[PDB]
Design a protein around this nucleic acid. Structure first.
Length: 343
RNA sequence: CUUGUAUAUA
């Protein structure tokens, strides 16, 4: 097409492309041009493009390059224009949220439209909550709905999740949604999610996706509800019972690190006490089967040892530091990092 | 062991 050739080989404006706007949106270079202009163009030039491609808004939403232009009409468009797009999305929320490129439009839309329009569209997913969470695209729409709409207006999300909370916490996308529900949810909503997890802590810590859900609970302050305090303690105790093993684990090691980093004075000392040498003599002559030496030699546990040095109390730090120094004398990047940070 | 984990468009 002539106008597209005039663009790439050379400047034009939105008034010059009145005949072929829809053609411009679907092309890559033609789209990036329209995105650029919509940010700076006056209302008149924006209306001209809009009133031309308004009928093909759904098709463009789904488009590889056209979806950006519809996004820009939410970001830079007028109230009347935003309302027109919303009216086209009604009855199509399930479909659009599943589409690879249209879900990006739905997510952008939720950020810019008014509170009443956000819930109105999201209510169309009230019966497909589990479907959407498990979807590669639809979970991001759910995540966005939680972030943009108050939980008190979204009772259908958690109520459709009761009984599936442990399964989703070990799922790729579900763990992202659970974290979001714990963040934006009320005291009662956090209760309902953690009740279904307070029985399976060892499994979550060692899981490839669950350990992130654990890590999120670990980095919560004591300012939160009564449940969050109890569950945090359960995690610390569980890690305290298996300090050596968890630190030698690929996924669980990160949980140990977060435990000694965000845990309270008492909680932190409980974990270290399982590793700490008994006195000055034990630290100087450690056996190869002691907690310290089993951790320093390990590929994952050495980071926990490194993490211990930083967060340790004057008395505890004194015993750990000299224990590492003793290991260097008897005998990789793991030992290089411990070496220098001691010196 | 130049050392260790999860989000989808040009």
């Amino acid at each position: 097409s002539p106008l597209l050739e005039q663009l790439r080989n050379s400047n034009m404006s939105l008034k010059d492309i009145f005949g072929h706007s829809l053609e411009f949106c679907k092309d890559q270079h033609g789209s990036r041009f329209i995105q650029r202009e919509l940010a700076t163009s006056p209302a008149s030039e924006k209306e001209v493009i809009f009133n031309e491609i308004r009928d093909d808004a759904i098709e463009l939403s789904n488009d590889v390059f056209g979806n950006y232009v519809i996004q820009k009409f939410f970001e830079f468009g007028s109230k009347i224009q935003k309302n027109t797009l919303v009216d086209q999305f009604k009855g199509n929320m399930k479909q659009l949220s599943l589409q690879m490129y249209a879900c990006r439009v739905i997510q952008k839309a939720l950020e810019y439209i008014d509170s009443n329009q956000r819930i109105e569209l999201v209510l169309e997913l009230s019966d497909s909550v589990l479907q959407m969470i498990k979807d590669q695209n639809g979970n991001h729409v759910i995540q966005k709905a939680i972030e943009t709409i108050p939980i008190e207006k979204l009772p259908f999300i958690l109520s459709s999740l009761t009984g599936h909370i442990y399964h989703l916490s070990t799922h790729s996308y579900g763990c992202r949604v659970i974290q979001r529900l714990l963040e934006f949810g009320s005291s009662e909503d956090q209760e309902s999610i953690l009740n279904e997890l307070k029985d399976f802590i060892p499994y979550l810590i060692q899981d490839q996706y669950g350990n992130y859900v654990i890590q999120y609970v670990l980095q919560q302050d004591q300012f939160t509800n009564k449940e969050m305090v109890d569950i945090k303690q359960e995690i610390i105790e569980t890690v305290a019972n298996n300090v050596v093993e968890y630190s030698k684990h690929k996924f669980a090691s990160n949980v140990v690190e977060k435990s000694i980093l965000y845990g309270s004075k008492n909680q932190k000392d409980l974990i270290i006490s399982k590793i700490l040498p008994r006195d000055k003599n034990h630290a100087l002559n450690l056996e190869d089967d002691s907690p310290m030496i089993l951790m320093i030699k390990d590929q994952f546990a050495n980071y926990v040892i490194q993490k211990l040095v930083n967060v340790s109390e004057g008395e505890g730090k004194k015993l750990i530091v000299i224990a590492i120094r003793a290991y260097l004398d008897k005998l990789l990047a793991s030992v290089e990092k411990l070496a220098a940070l001691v010196e």
